[PDB]
Design a protein around this ligand. Structure first.
Ligand SMILES: CC(C)[C@@H](OC(=O)[C@H](CS)NC(=O)CCC[C@H](N)C(=O)O)C(=O)O
Ligand SMILES: [Fe+2]
Length: 328
């Protein structure tokens, strides 16, 4: 299997005020988005070793009792409000992966969207503080650290498409973003049950099948164990691991807005028998955010696609992904 072209881009100028330097970064983002659709953001400023250590401390100490008590509705019928946020249990002998998802920390009981019971907005659930000291505070601060990197990346994507730097970022706000963090644990298992291993049409053993992301962009930290593959014209190629950077790609909302100039790359997760972490941040806008679709390949920039509100896109996208590739 050939290695996919995944450039490392120094995104540090996107946090500053050197406009020329920002345009040179935007060009790199444009090139990577038009090629394989993936790049590693380096010089991003986030302490990813600490993220990995705090996540490991949580995954390895949470107990079965706590998992039921934090479980989403798919695993625990008592928790009807938990569609997105909470614990996603493994099923020994059948399903290896397990994870913990949380949303905007500003979705509190008094938030207007929580009061209106608007779909896709939920109040986060957390384990007991005495059992996981400092975890909630760490995780909430991580959300804001990765939100800040994502705002900087969105300035780069906007400039890359010929827009002003706040084109996307003006719709990505702390008070209403639907962005989520998922702390995924992929375990080492001896024996590794065959029921938890899927097989692609090309014979590749997988943990998660081909898909496009449900996001504007996806900002991912993963352990140093190679696992992702991206479909290109030359076939599926391996994305090398880099546990010092963030792997960035576009989701189908970006493909919609750009009339597929920046496609949402199709990718999948190979089966690897290794204890590792996959920690995505899905950059989602607000429920009512609507960006008018355009086409940077057309002289007048017009598109034959209709505006789609982010909330509608997200609710239906998450359900469709579960229908296609299974409840995680
Ligand atoms: C490919 C990486 C990102 C990861 O997959 C994933 O995270 C997969 C495919 S992108 N994503 C999802 O299942 C969507 C989770 C959405 C989250 N519950 C939310 O409510 O916002 C993996 O399996 O390692
Ligand atoms: Fe994905």
């Amino acid at each position: 299997v050939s290695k996919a072209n995944v450039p490392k881009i120094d995104v540090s100028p996107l946090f500053g005020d050197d406009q020329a330097a920002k345009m040179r970064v935007a060009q790199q983002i444009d090139a990577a988005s038009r090629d394989t659709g993936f790049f590693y953001a380096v010089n991003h400023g986030i302490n990813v070793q600490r993220l990995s250590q705090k996540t490991k401390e949580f995954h390895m100490s949470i107990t079965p009792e706590e998992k039921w008590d934090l479980a989403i509705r798919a695993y625990n019928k008592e928790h009807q409000d938990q569609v997105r946020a909470g614990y996603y249990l493994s099923i020994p002998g059948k399903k290896a992966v397990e994870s913990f998802c949380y949303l905007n920390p500003n979705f509190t009981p008094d938030h207007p969207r929580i009061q209106a019971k608007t779909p896709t907005h939920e109040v986060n659930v957390w384990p007991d503080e005495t059992k996981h000291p400092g975890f909630q505070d760490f995780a909430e601060q991580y959300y804001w650290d990765v939100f800040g990197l994502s705002s900087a990346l969105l300035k780069g994507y906007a400039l890359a498409l010929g827009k002003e730097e706040n084109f996307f970022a003006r719709h990505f706000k702390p008070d209403d973003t639907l962005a989520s963090v998922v702390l995924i644990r992929y375990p080492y298992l001896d024996p590794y049950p065959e029921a938890a291993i899927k097989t692609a049409a090309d014979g590749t053993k997988l943990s998660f099948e081909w898909h496009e992301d449900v996001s504007l962009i996806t900002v991912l930290y993963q352990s140093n164990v190679q696992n992702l593959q991206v479909e290109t014209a030359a076939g599926y190629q391996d994305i090398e691991a880099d546990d010092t950077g963030y792997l960035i790609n576009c989701g189908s909302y970006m493909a919609h807005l750009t009339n597929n100039y920046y496609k949402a790359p199709i990718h999948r997760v190979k089966w690897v028998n290794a204890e590792r972490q996959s920690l995505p941040f899905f950059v989602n806008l607000g429920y009512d955010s609507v960006i008018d679709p355009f086409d940077p390949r057309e002289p007048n920039g017009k598109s034959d696609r209709e505006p789609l509100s982010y909330g509608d896109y997200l609710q239906n996208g998450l359900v469709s992904l579960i229908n296609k590739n299974g409840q995680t």
